[model samples]
Target: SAIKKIKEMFDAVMPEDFYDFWAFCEELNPKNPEDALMDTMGLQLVGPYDVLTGKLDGSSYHLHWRYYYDPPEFMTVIRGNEDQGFHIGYYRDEPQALPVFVASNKAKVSCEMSVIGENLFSALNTCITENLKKIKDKSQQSSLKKMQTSLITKAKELQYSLATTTPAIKARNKKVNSKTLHKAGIVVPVNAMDVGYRPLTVTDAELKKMLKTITESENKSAKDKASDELQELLTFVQFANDEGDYGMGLELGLDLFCFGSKQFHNTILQLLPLAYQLLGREKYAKIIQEHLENRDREKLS
Candidate 1:
């Protein structure tokens, strides 16, 4: 249905001026290298998203969004005269409901977007779900859950370790493992991970642990101990902090759980009024809804 809708939208709305854009996408897309560059503009360029801060400058937005680089690629052209960068968008299960701002008047000079209804978001949702079904791993989902639990526990340990001890000048290890219980050390990763199941936000402790693991030290015991702990902890964190180079991934995973699930995203969209009422960000939910209601083709116009 998703592919069908996209095709329908393309046939119904894709203007001649925008043919090249889809051509560029189909040819450049990572998923279908051999597939002809047909009208692959709307959903194909939805792009990846960030939960807490809303979607990045370009791309689709969703939960568990591994789709950012999944296929041809999630992309969006610059809206105006501003410099633009394409962003890897969202996951399969989550909604890629975003405005067709770029696909509209800017990049392609098209019009499928002008009459797009909520069906576009629905079709996009289905499209991604169909793709996700192809790679759905019951075991990996379980493993990811386990990893989330482990990281939370370690985050607590990091909080405790950083909060207890004095700043021992003798060993950098002592400084790193200070038992001083301050809010900063304890809260950073917690707040970061709090965003979603898979978050890109690197906890402070995790970063410090990574740095300590790589650098050389004079004291054998301190170096060995920190190195060993870092090795194990970072191995876990490294797995979580995916796509850190591009920003968003694990950290965004956390968001996936928080706001990316199909059910959750839809529910949230419906409950935006209540959310804004409770959170006091009166316009926040409204803004999200604007994007949620906006069809992909609208941006493609």
Candidate 2:
């Protein structure tokens, strides 16, 4: 009965091929048993993901999908920041697990979130269809209908508010002031270094020794210092003129750049020169010409 009810709800809201997608998921026979269970039995769960900053509408939102429950239900949980979002978890069956509207943290709407979660869906279902038809005024129809309409409208309004809201006016002002200070040469990042004219380089023997030093060091500061130097050396290898050196350097860079740092950013820019050099640049001597242009720009800047 629960399965049928869930199906009915899906039939109402889902695209026709939704079942096909679910079936494909079942066929995977994944090695992980939890994956199998989640894929089968008409219920599907997808995505526990992070949306990087500026991914959607210049705002970040994390979303997870839970679809195909016994009562044929689906839910989407969306969260932004500490409290600036809501959950949509309702079942056709009684005792819904969520509210239709929720607000994060100290937003004005959060107060309504608690009360609405408790009763909003329940109230709507109780008065839907037949109850709606019985109501004299169309505007006074079931809470469900009103909420369905309002949910979309409210979600958009809240999203806009959250995205644009500036709670830290002082912090914003401080950032602006810092920009002004930077222009006056009174501020710079602590780790800022003068760009070296020559690329940092190391031989294979030196690279091996550096790696061994990092692995054997018990002292925290020594280990970190070795790692940073190792990273800088690996980046230099990534841009080497020798093909074998470039390949090894790129592999090492990938392995070491997982944690990421300023060195990673600096080295990625070197890839352009390497690409040009490899693509018949020696015939045209474009690599040397580009290097000259780069030096000129560096001096002018």
Candidate 3:
């Protein structure tokens, strides 16, 4: 039921043309999978907020919709203002590791809180009224409307919390330079993805090598840079998982396992059940057994 609700929400906010394009892509194999791949990648690259705004440029995508209590270390806090506050960067899930934001234009008073928040409220409002006639039971209709209203209220609260209590404010209070943030590349153009960022592909072996080098290095700065690269790769695994490309996820997870670090181990464990589901119990058992035995032997040495 929740899945159906989420799907309905997704459809409501997505553009009709984009919705048609998504549906069509599912039925027929596009002649150029590369373009399709890139387009899909770009769509994923944009934030949910931007998608609703019907803006194709990189900046239109809403990056910092809300903040997690325990957001990943890779997420950076960027500046905004007092009422609107700041935005957070999502490194491990986007096409590239570039810091993204809901541009200042969207933060302005005339623009209001969030394009997504307003659109969602409007969509739910419309849905409640339109769906009322279809339902025969008056109690059920009332209950549905109540639930929709509750969701809208929660969405508004979420928008308020994001503006005020974001990590960027914490950074500012800690004496982090607000101006230097932009020089550090956190303040980027709305169309940054169009002109600057590009997705990078890395082979499994290459990633293993890079991880090994980074782990062994004593230089904190160099290690941080490598860690960012690793984060980007992890994002790929996450993307594959989200797309149900379990085979690709499994492959990458296994390759990452060679690093023998706790981080990759956790990542592999996270992918295990999914891979197990896709490959079945027997195949999953054999693969896990082999990897475990090898890791054990390496540990003993």
Q: Choose the strongest candidate by TM-score.
A: 3
Q: Write the per-residue lDDT of candidate 3 for residues 186-217, one digit (tens) a residue.
A: 11112323321222277544665678767688
TM-score-wise, the better of 1 and 3 is 3
Clashing pairs in 3: 59-190
Residue pairs with clashing backbones, model 2:
2-70, 6-71, 6-72, 83-104, 99-117, 124-144
Worst 10 residues of 3 by lDDT: 177-186
Model 3 TM-score is 0.28
Candidate 1 lDDT by residue in tens digits, 124-213:
223323334555468654633443344235434433221122232123232221111111010011235343123223454564453444
Superposition TM-score, candidate 1 onto the true structure: 0.19
Between candidates 2 and 3, name the one with more favorable lDDT. Answer: 3
For candidate 1, the 10 contiguous residues with the lowest summed lDDT are 180-189
Could you tell which candidate, 2 or 3, scores higher by TM-score?
Answer: 3
* Model 3: lDDT of residue 244: 47
Over the full model, what C-alpha lDDT does candidate 3 score relative to the true structure?
0.36
For each candidate, what TM-score against the reference?
A: 0.19, 0.21, 0.28
TM-score of 2: 0.21
Q: Pick the candidate with the highest lDDT.
A: 3
